[PDB]
Amino acid sequence: DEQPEPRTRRRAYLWCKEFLPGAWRGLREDEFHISVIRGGLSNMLFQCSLPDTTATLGDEPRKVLLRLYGGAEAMVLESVMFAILAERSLGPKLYGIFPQGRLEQFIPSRRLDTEELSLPDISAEIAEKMATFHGMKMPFNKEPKWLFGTMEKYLKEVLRIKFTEESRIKKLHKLLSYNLPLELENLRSLLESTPSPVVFCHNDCQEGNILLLEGRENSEKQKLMLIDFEYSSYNYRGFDIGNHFCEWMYDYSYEKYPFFRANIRKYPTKKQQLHFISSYLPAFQNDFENLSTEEKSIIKEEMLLEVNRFALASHFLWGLWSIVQAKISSIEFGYMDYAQARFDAYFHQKRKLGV
Numbered sequence: 001d002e003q004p005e006p007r008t009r010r011r012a013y014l015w016c017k018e019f020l021p022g023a024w025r026g027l028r029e030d031e032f033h034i035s036v037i038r039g040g041l042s043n044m045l046f047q048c049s050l051p052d053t054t055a056t057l058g059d060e061p062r063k064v065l066l067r068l069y070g071g072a073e074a075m076v077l078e079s080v081m082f083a084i085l086a087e088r089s090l091g092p093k094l095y096g097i098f099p100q101g102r103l104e105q106f107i108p109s110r111r112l113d114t115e116e117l118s119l120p121d122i123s124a125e126i127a128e129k130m131a132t133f134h135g136m137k138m139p140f141n142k143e144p145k146w147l148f149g150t151m152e153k154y155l156k157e158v159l160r161i162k163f164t165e166e167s168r169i170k171k172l173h174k175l176l177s178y179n180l181p182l183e184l185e186n187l188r189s190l191l192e193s194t195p196s197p198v199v200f201c202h203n204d205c206q207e208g209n210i211l212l213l214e215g216r217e218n219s220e221k222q223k224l225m226l227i228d229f230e231y232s233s234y235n236y237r238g239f240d241i242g243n244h245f246c247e248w249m250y251d252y253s254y255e256k257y258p259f260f261r262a263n264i265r266k267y268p269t270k271k272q273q274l275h276f277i278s279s280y281l282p283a284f285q286n287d288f289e290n291l292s293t294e295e296k297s298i299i300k301e302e303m304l305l306e307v308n309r310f311a312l313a314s315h316f317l318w319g320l321w322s323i324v325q326a327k328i329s330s331i332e333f334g335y336m337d338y339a340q341a342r343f344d345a346y347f348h349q350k351r352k353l354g355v
């Protein structure tokens with residue numbers, strides 16, 4: 001039970017006392033319980049709780065999550081999004097919002113590991129949860145400018161990076177030797193000919209953003225929750241699914257430099273992809289199962305091509321993102337090696353597709 005700084009404990013006490021009802025309003029500071037869940041310099045997480053000897057007065061929570069962020073448009077959109085998903089029972093409830101952070105429902109859980117993404121019941125539920133997410137109507141721009149707008153933005157940053165450390169200079173020269181402007185436009189041309197509906201996408205469906213709900217671990221359905229919606233946007237459906245498939249290949253729990261492992265052989269097989277989309281489609285279009293077997297087959301075959309082509313944009317986007325992080329991040333991760341891993345997978349997948 002790691003304790004926060006006294007000033008943070010004091011601030012958290014005050015946010016809980018003023019934003020939460022019932023027993024919280026009369027809580028004494030010396031009976032306030034708080035422990036650090038996740039540290040860092042940004043989006044620190046804390047668990048805040050009543051003492052076990054304090055009875056609740058009504059329906060107020062006994063335990064909450066405090067998220068501390070530490071532009072203004074980004075704050076408005078993210079806060080509105082989180083509030084809406086909470087109303088719709090698709091994210092944790094929202095108890096309080098303030099300039100420094102927010103108070104959220106505490107969901108007893110652990111995150112999934114990379115290997116668990118391939119378990120058939122897990123994969124089927126992720127597909128169902130993603131299809132549900134993709135049905136959200138949200139009050140945000142519905143033009144799918146996000147994917148290539150972000151890749152163009154990152155590419156312009158990357159081309160101008162001036163590293164001073166020798167290994168980063170050398171690794172950057174290799175990544176730029178591919179002629180990334182031209183490759184990005186070849187990717188744009190391919191995806192422009194690849195139909196994919198524009199839906200509200202999570203854009204980051206990795207194992208670290210999927211909760212395994214405590215006490216549901218042996219239940220066949222409804223044991224997961226997708227969280228961490230910060231990067232969500234209207235986007236091509238194929239990206240959300242392809243990006244999720246790419247995440248089967250990357251384990252971020254490796255405790256040595258470069259602090260990830262990559263395994264191209266862990267990408268879902270076409271059998272595993274069919275299992276996923278066979279759960280996705282009836283969750284996204286609930287009379288899907290009443291179609292003929294041949295019409296379902298066509299839809300599934302076309303989706304396989306769609307998602308594996310958009311998986312290329314997952315590699316390209318995250319590869320560029322990682323180079324940018326190598327320049328600007330304050331965190332110990334092997335960003336340049338991860339970039340090379342994503343571009344290696346980009347070209348490997350390009351070959352398999354024949355493009």
Ligand SMILES: CN(C)c1cc[n+](Cc2ccc(CCCCc3ccc(C[n+]4ccc(N5CCCC5)cc4)cc3)cc2)cc1
Nearest residue numbers: 203204206208231252253259260317318321331332333338
């Ligand atoms: C949609 N999109 C463009 C993004 C979506 C979300 N982010 C947040 C996002 C922000 C920051 C990071 C770096 C975190 C550094 C601290 C930290 C270090 C290691 C680990 C274990 N770990 C290591 C690497 C890791 N990665 C995710 C793929 C990139 C690699 C995850 C977990 C976890 C945390 C990663 C993702 C950024 C971009």
